[PDB]
């Protein structure tokens, strides 16, 4: 009789998509990424800075 919006009303959000509980529990919206230290090539940097 009345459309209830998910993205609010977490009861309806959980009725759909049972994975929202795991998402919220593990904070998958705030996932820290693994660090990497690869460096751009000197040709790339020189091309970027070129006039």
């Amino acid at each position: 009789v009345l459309k209830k919006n998910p993205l609010k009303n977490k009861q309806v959000l959980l009725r759909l998509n049972p994975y929202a509980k795991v998402f919220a529990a593990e904070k998958l919206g705030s996932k820290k990424a693994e660090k990497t230290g690869t460096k751009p090539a000197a040709v790339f940097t020189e091309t970027l800075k070129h006039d």
Binding site: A41, V43, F44, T47, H50
Partner: protein
Amino acid sequence: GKSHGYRSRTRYMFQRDFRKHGAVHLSTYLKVYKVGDIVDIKANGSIQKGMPHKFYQGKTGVVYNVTKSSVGVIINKMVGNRYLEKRLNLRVEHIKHSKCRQEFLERVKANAAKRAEAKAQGVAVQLKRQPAQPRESRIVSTEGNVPQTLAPVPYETFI
């Protein structure tokens, strides 16, 4: 007064092409037409018998009748709010086979060949054609191709 004769406004459409006048080459008369063939209409101005009316220039139809020197062609014509069926008796000089239909029949043969090969190995041969797809990812190397280009040019007269 006005003038709406049979060949009015056909001055250029019934031209022979440039340096292409004279007699018709024999392959035109050696072509074979059967009932159901799809043909294009292009009037030859040097042949005044069996010529189509200017409306049917560039129209494509279906053969329904074969006579001694002519072919009956069915053309759907726009009259008012509906299409009417029109039957033309045209000599073979004004008719050529539709290359589109020839290539479609070739595609039918190739589709059968692919399906039969997939019947042995490689199931789901995916007969249907597809529209051009967006490009996939790619890597563009700079080795020997360093990006280097200049800016827009200043104005100058060249006069």
